[PDB]
Design a protein around this ligand. Structure first.
Ligand SMILES: [Zn+2]
Ligand SMILES: [Zn+2]
Lengths: 48, 242, 224, 80, 43, 36, 357, 302
């Protein structure tokens, strides 16, 4: 995405569903949120 | 387990709520008390019946999980895609051949007589009659405009153990459901009696599915071509406002 | 003698030379069962007695050399394929033995045989294909490109706002009778009143805005 | 390491038509391969290699499991 | 190595030998599902 | 070694006359190896 | 006439295909059909409960005695087998699952493969030499199997390959029949191609209510000689019948000894003149239990309860029968039901003998 | 899977060599560079007795006996000597001291157990005594499951001295408690082993190898596993292997219509019967080939 992009897709808006498949930028944004689940799950043991 | 090829610690799935356990590869310790003093206290204090009611949230811990929650819904459902949800005498007796409780009496039934799921559930709840009346998880006003709910499935009522109407699901038989069926049995008949009814009602739910079936497929997830155009037309409105 | 035998019997070079000797029958196909058979295998493979290996100084000079000397110049691509496999195996052994002995004119022949074995590997990979299929698009003549992905499209502003500039609030459900005899023909209810006024004799036709009172499917009749 | 003697699912004697199914398949691929390197066959994006009629001619029934295991089983001789 | 180094951390004297314990007559294995067992029973 | 094992790992010897436990052996102490 | 309209069809190689023809002719020099071929048999049953048909199917699948090829301990000669990849486990797993049609338990084979070449040599099943027993006038297994493969300069010597008998339930190598069809001909079906009905089974009656008594069952046998197919399949069918009868007769020896204290039969006298019978039999499957429940239910329409609970982790079948009669009358009814089962399978025997010429 | 193509030449610790491997019916571009590891097990997505609840699976016993996910598991024993103090040999009861209770020294041959014999718990696999009359520093096989001595050798270490190397092999089948997984990350533990006559079967005779709970999907949204079953079901009948690499153009609506063109249903579900009772389900069950892989977590070691 270009610098100072205005479209909502550039900021994590995934327009597609799982049954229809995601594109490369949508999968990267999904991995950004998916990695947080793995990180917070690890912290949910030690920090607790 | 007399089978020499079994090396695992097997337990009921409804007992996982005590340990926050699942069967993805978890390992659990087990030691058998041998001292008389420790063996006495295991039976009287540390028995799992003493923690059917959570000491944390003051509510029940155990219930139906993932097959007797949907199994109880199908069993207590009023209408089946193949007509009314009834069964003959032979298949009504087959639901009680695994519960390990004393069988009911089916002598007042011809082989061609039909029994609905409410009657079958009632014969098991007569042992511990309770009073319950709530709205099941099946009913949801989110789904209401786009669904034709059955008026006999959105009101679960039990008086003196007789399931008058409604379906049994997470609200009534689910694990951790405060005020549920097994919470009322424990308060009136003891936590050990509630555990036996969890197992007993689990078998009817599982025995019903033995020939009713339950599956998930890829077409269960596929929008129709006309509905797909409606989904992106909704998303285009969001991108238009954005 | 024991330490020498233990060292050499664990050398993969010894096992490979022993396999080559077994192929043409210089040593028995079965591994030795008695020390005499082991000594005979050592003498045939290494080429020197363990007693006399400690007396002199070389080691690689007299290791087995296959009996049949096929013509590897037909490995120049030129009952042919199994013979080619046999030539590949024999030349691999001969070149490995030359590498051990630091034979002159070695790197060029190594490169030539590596090219030959790469061609043989191409053939072997041809033999190792399960197959492949592509779901062709009937309209085209190649891999299907049709997808159910989202495609952006600038909808008219009439879909979000009415002719007075207010936003739409689609919150009235309009139900029409499946059969004609049922009356009334249509019922307009709110989400709270669906369970109390709608039965299976009705079907959801369209939504309605609670502000401008227009059907969602008739939103295009507004002047943009 | 080879095509199983019997189907893993039901136990139909797949193995007795295994070897033939291997070799014959190769020529069929050679018929449909086309100006392409062997190791690039699963990336051609233009191939239509169908083995339905070959397995049918072998006499194997139209069972999903049997044809799956016959087609998809790797051979250790072809990689080592 | 020192005497007082044995105390502090998790693998120390207090948290590994006193607050915790290695015991005999104990078993461990992977758990499994069995719908024929009661909730108060273990296979 | 008449009985290779009774499927139960034991670290102790027993008397052949009555069965009483004589003593137990797990590992050699091996601490006198550092002498003077 | 319970069992009528049977049809038998072998599974043969189509030599009209050039690829298969060339491959077979250059591999095994094969130009005609193999000595042993699979056979699909479709059977129509009328006036019989689905419990009996399904029990017959189960017995033919993995409860009928069957023969395999096994290696005696010490047969795999480590002294001579120099191959590093053809381990004993792999090779014996290959050998156990070769479908055989044996005549006696005396045949002993041997596999002696020597690789004097420079290329990997494939060990087929035609390299199994019979070394003990009477000489075979007809092969007992197909010669086109792939037992293994030897690296150059390697060997594989295996002796004492004998014929072992067992039931398919204990080990899958004794499995006999593979399922190919099962349907009820007295129940109508929806067209499931339509999207309205594709989520349903298809039958117009729910299994909770339907009681079909006209079935079609089709089973495939993996190895049957070409010139004696009708002789083999018939035998198989007949065999199954005897097995079931035999097992049923075992229960018939329990009820006959209800006076003496017997561990496998327990009788209680409940309230309201009700009697209870518990029959616990070890190493029984759902076949016998389902047959017993179905025939007791048919014999006593107004029975209070009947169930055949077969427990996986207990390896036993517990049949509970509660009825409002006395102990003697209940035992009489149970014996009558057992006799009904016996006569039904005797009629099946007779129909099998009558149909397949 | 095939953990190494030169496994017989190696003496490795805790290594499993699965005999049978299959290329997935829906393969990817990653299989152009590495060997696939797993089998195309026929999987039924159904509720069957409640033994597959809470991420468990039901495994056909016949599939286990035929070699499904079966292989050999290896362990090694590396024992060293003290130069001129210790030695390899069978001890004698009347001279050597503090022999291990309940041991079995009779299986030793010249200090090592011969290759091909079965060593069980309590057996002395390596004989070793230190000369003081003698003290017994023997090595005993302390494992519950019996092993087979696969390879014995006496190499020379970096210090030019003999040490004992023994390779023990274990015949491992798939048993209850072994962990399996799909390619979508839905792992599971084998819970029940049913015979070939107790598994459910379709009208056409198809029966599952694994029975997984349908409740494993909705919370984890592993849609690629369900699409793989739909695509792979048509590939088997069509006799083809297709590519399912990520980010390739797919249309599940078109893939579902491809099933009907092959004689199946649009949804891929089929009429099935209960193997224990012979009673058909009142629902078409989604059954098809899904590529499953055995994770190397053995209950016989944990
Ligand atoms: Zn408006
Ligand atoms: Zn199959």
């Amino acid at each position: 995405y270009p610098r100072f992009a205005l479209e909502a897709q550039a900021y994590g808006f995934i327009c597609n569903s799982y049954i229809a498949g995601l594109t490369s930028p949508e999968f990267i944004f999904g991995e950004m949120n998916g990695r947080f689940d793995l990180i917070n799950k690890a912290l949910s043991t030690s920090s607790t | 387990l007399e089978n020499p090829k079994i090396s695992t610690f097997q337990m009921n799935v409804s007992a996982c709520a005590w340990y926050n356990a699942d069967f993805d590869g978890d390992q659990m310790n087990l030691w058998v008390p041998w001292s008389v003093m420790s063996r006495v206290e295991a039976e009287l204090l540390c028995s799992v019946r003493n923690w059917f009611i959570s000491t944390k949230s003051s509510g029940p811990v155990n219930g139906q999980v993932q097959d007797s929650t949907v199994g109880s819904f199908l069993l207590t459902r009023t209408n089946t895609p193949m007509g009314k949800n009834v069964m003959n005498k032979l298949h009504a007796m087959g639901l009680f051949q695994t519960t390990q409780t004393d069988p009911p009496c089916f002598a007042n039934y011809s082989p061609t007589d039909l029994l609905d799921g409410k009657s079958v559930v009632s014969m098991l709840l007569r042992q511990t009659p309770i009073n319950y009346q709530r709205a099941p998880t099946w009913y949801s006003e989110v789904y209401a405009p786009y669904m034709h709910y059955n008026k006999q499935d959105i009101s679960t009522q039990i008086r003196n153990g007789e399931l008058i109407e409604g379906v049994l699901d997470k609200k009534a038989v689910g694990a951790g459901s405060s005020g549920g069926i097994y919470h009322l049995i424990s308060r009136r008949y003891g936590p050990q009696q509630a555990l036996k009814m969890i197992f007993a009602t689990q078998q009817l739910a599982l025995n019903y599915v033995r020939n009713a079936g339950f599956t998930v497929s890829t077409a269960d997830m596929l929008l129709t071509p006309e509905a797909h155009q409606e989904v992106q037309e909704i998303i285009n409105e969001l991108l238009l406002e954005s | 003698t024991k330490v020498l035998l233990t060292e050499i019997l664990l050398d993969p070079m010894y096992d490979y030379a022993a396999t080559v000797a077994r192929i043409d029958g210089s040593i028995p196909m079965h591994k030795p069962r008695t020390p005499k058979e082991a000594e005979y295998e050592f003498k045939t493979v290494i080429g020197r007695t363990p007693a006399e290996l400690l007396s002199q100084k070389e080691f690689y000079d007299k290791i087995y050399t296959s009996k049949y000397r096929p013509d590897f110049t037909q490995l120049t691509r030129l009952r042919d394929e199994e013979k080619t496999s046999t030539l590949i195996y024999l030349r691999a052994y001969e070149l490995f033995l030359k590498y051990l002995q630091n034979a002159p004119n070695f790197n060029s022949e190594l490169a030539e045989f590596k090219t030959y074995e790469n061609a043989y590997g191409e053939q072997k990979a041809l033999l190792a294909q399960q197959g492949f299929y592509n779901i062709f698009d009937p309209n085209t003549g190649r891999a299907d490109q049709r997808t159910r992905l989202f495609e952006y499209k600038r909808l008219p502003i009439s879909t979000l706002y009415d002719e007075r500039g207010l936003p739409h609030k689609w919150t009235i459900y309009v139900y029409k009778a499946v059969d004609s005899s049922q009356k009334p023909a249509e019922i307009e209810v709110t989400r709270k009143d669906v369970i109390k006024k709608i039965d299976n004799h009705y079907a959801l036709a369209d939504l309605r805005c609670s502000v401008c009172h227009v059907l969602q499917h008739e939103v295009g009749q507004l002047n943009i | 390491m080879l095509i199983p003697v019997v189907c893993f699912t039901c136990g139909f004697p797949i193995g007795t038509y295994a070897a033939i199914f291997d070799k014959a398949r190769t020529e069929y691929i050679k018929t449909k391969m086309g100006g392409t390197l062997p190791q690039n066959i699963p990336l051609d994006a233009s191939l239509q290699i169908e083995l339905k009629d070959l397995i049918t001619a072998l006499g194997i029934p139209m069972r999903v499991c049997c044809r799956t295991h016959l087609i998809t089983t790797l051979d250790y001789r072809k990689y080592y | 190595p020192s005497i007082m180094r044995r105390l502090p951390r998790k693998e120390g004297r207090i948290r590994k030998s006193l607050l915790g314990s290695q015991v005999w007559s104990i078993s461990r294995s992977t758990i499994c599902g069995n719908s024929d067992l009661h909730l108060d029973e273990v296979g | 070694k008449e009985k290779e094992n009774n499927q139960g790992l034991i670290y102790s010897y027993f008397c052949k006359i009555c069965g009483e436990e004589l003593a137990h052996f797990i590992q050699e102490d091996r601490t006198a190896d550092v002498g003077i | 006439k319970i069992f009528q309209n049977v049809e038998i069809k072998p599974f043969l190689i189509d030599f009209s295909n050039l690829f298969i023809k060339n491959a077979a002719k250059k591999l095994f020099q094969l130009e005609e059909q193999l000595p042993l071929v699979p056979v699909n048999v479709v059977m129509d049953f009328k006036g019989i409960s689905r419990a009996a048909v399904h029990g017959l199917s189960r017995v033919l699948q993995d409860e009928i005695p069957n023969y395999m090829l096994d290696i005696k301990p010490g047969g795999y000669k480590i002294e001579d087998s120099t191959d590093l990849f053809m381990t004993e486990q792999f090779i014996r797993n290959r050998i156990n699952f070769i479908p055989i049609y044996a005549k006696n338990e005396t045949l002993v084979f041997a596999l002696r493969s020597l690789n004097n070449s420079c290329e990997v040599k494939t060990i087929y099943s035609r390299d199994l030499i019979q070394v003990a027993g009477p000489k075979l006038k007809y092969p007992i297994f197909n010669p086109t199997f792939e037992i293994g493969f030897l690296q150059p300069g390697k060997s594989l010597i295996i002796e004492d390959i004998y014929i072992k008998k067992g039931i398919g339930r204990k080990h899958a190598a004794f499995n006999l029949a593979v399922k190919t069809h099962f349907s009820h001909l007295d129940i109508e079906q929806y067209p499931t191609d339509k999207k309205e009905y594709m989520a349903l089974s298809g039958y117009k009656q729910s299994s909770m209510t339907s009681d079909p008594r006209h079935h079609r069952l089709g089973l495939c046998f993996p190895a049957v000689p070409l010139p004696h197919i009708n002789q083999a399949v018939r035998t198989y069918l007949k065999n199954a019948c005897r097995i079931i009868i035999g097992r049923i007769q075992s229960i018939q020896k329990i009820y006959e000894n209800f006076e003496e204290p017997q561990p496998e039969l327990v009788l209680f006298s409940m309230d309201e003149e009700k009697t209870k019978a518990i029959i616990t039999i070890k190493d029984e499957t759902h076949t016998i239990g389902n047959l017993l429940k179905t025939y007791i239910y048919e014999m006593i329409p107004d029975i209070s309860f009947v169930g055949y609970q077969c427990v996986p982790h207990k390896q036993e079948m517990v049949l509970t029968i509660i009825h409002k009669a006395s102990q003697e009358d209940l035992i009489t009814l149970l014996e009558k039901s057992i006799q009904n089962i016996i006569q039904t399978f005797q009629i099946l025997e007779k129909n099998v003998d009558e149909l397949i010429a | 899977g095939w953990y190494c193509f030169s496994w017989p030449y190696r003496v490795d610790m805790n290594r499993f060599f699965q005999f049978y491997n299959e290329m997935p019916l829906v393969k990817t571009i990653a299989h152009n560079y590495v060997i696939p590891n797993g089998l195309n097990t026929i999987v039924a997505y159904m509720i069957y007795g409640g033994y597959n609840q809470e991420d468990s699976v039901i495994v056909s016993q016949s599939f286990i006996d035929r070699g499904g996910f079966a292989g050999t598991f290896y362990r090694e024993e590396k024992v060293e000597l003290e130069s001129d103090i210790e030695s390899f040999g069978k001890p004698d009861p009347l001279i050597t001291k503090n022999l291990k209770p309940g041991a079995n020294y009779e299986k030793l041959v010249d200090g090592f157990v011969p290759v091909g014999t079965v060593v069980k718990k309590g057996d002395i696999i390596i004989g070793k005594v230190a000369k003081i009359k003698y003290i017994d520093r023997s090595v005993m096989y302390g494992f519950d499951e019996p092993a087979v001595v696969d390879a014995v050798m006496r190499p020379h270490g970096p210090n030019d001295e003999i040490f004992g190397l023994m390779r023990l092999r274990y015949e491992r089948n798939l048993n209850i408690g072994d962990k399996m997984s799909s390619r979508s990350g839905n792992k599971g533990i084998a819970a029940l082993a049913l015979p070939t006559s107790d598994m459910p079967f379709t009208e056409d005779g198809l029966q599952p190898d694994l029975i997984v709970n349908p409740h494993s999907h909705p919370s984890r949204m592993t849609n690629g596993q369900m699409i793989e079953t739909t695509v792979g079901l048509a590939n088997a009948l069509q006799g083809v292997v297709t590519d399912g690499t990520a980010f390739l153009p797919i249309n599940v609506q078109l893939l579902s219509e491809r099933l009907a063109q092959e004689g199946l249903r649009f949804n891929g579900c089929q009429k099935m019967f209960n193997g224990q009772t012979g009673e058909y389900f009142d629902a078409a069950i989604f059954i098809g080939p899904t590529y499953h892989q055995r994770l190397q977590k053995f209950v016989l070691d944990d």
